[PDB]
């Protein structure tokens, strides 16, 4: 079995940033910190934390750290139950901009109605999102990844549909001899050539790109002719209804979405999951 | 936090039905059971279990029992998660290009024969190699450094010998009055003036340098006359045997080599070390 005192020490090293920080935080000698790490590492057979500052968990160490933060969540829920007061637990979530700007906001209502829980939303790309989940820096995440990261369970939420849209004037500007010049048409991007697959055959030259790093500004730039773009049908629907933009393409792009959460008998985590799933049921496709 | 040992004792009392049942189940005295319960109760401020039989949890005690069963499930799942992640995680080594291109590859055979083990090799100069070891970013390292870095143990692997070689034509091209113009002779380098020490006396002029950042391409450039260079005798032996290059110099340069690994009771690391030592025995000089 794994010594829970030693797990606490590893977590303290990480939370405090160094071995000395864990020493001061835990009121134990530096030798005790070192001895506890040595023992835990010898139990696992791997180095668990970097000897630099700020202290970082290794790949093997991330497992234990994630586990330690799970135990912290159980302890808080337990203390809250005995206490006779609403839990007041901070929930940290990784989410993508497209989910946050379309179907997710109804979750805010649900969380608000609880005791005094708080949300910390992190907007992350796919790779960092999974890393946050792995090391325990978030307890849940909305993601395109279907395979569960270690320590987590996965739930399918439904499918997000993107439409290829542009203003009629912009499309007409890049019509050439009755054929649309996809490569030459300025395009919108959320940040710094897959999007032309099956739209252009030969090699694609350089492309004109505008970058607008917010879901709503991204939609506004498309809406206003700065470029075409792939926009979630939820965002695009009103512009299409208003005739502000048109479909460049009858072929939608569908992206399955998943909710990944710590595997833990957590009543907060169960509750948050229900809220997210219910929102995705109401706002995503089968 | 609540002492998890005490939570186990409370859980055992309920699961076993009496204080004496928890005693035998836990291999502790009835006094030890009582001490833990009383301690847990005063930490909480509530009576947790009846001292009658069968033991019944109070309202607060039902909470801690529920929590204890949650923590038991987490502990078992964590142990299973770590075990599976360790299998997936590659052992990380820092090595220099000269070892990787000569005596090291036989290590691959040994690792391949294990379960489904993986290696991550990092090609590093001497300085970054030792820092990677120090900080825990690699578990082992091939190094010229003989003194053990903190957290690691050292083993001598043997000696690497370098030869100064060139094509016959290149040497003859820079023979003048029977004396070789070392400074004027183009040289090969692995990347961006020690190498002429004991070959030229006074201050050295400019030098003609080609850079080829691969061990094998480095050898090819020498083999093909682009410049002379210091080449591991392992690599140079075939070219010398074929008469493609010659020795510019009977003075070899010998560099003792060492294997440094983190001190950990790991059978994985022990196996890797043995494989490395054995490969070094076959491809380095005593």
Numbering used by the authors:
A (entry chain A), B (entry chain B): 0 to 191, 197 to 290
Describing publication, verbatim:
During size-exclusion chromatography, LysG eluted as a peak representing a molecular mass of 158 kDa. Based on the mass of 34 kDa deduced from the protein sequence, this indicates a tetrameric assembly of LysG in solution.
LysG detects the basic amino acids l-lysine, l-histidine, and l-arginine and activates gene expression of the amino acid transporter encoding gene lysE in the presence of elevated intracellular amino acid concentrations. Two LysG monomers are coupled by dimerization of their DNA-binding domains, forming a winged helix-turn-helix motif responsible for DNA binding.
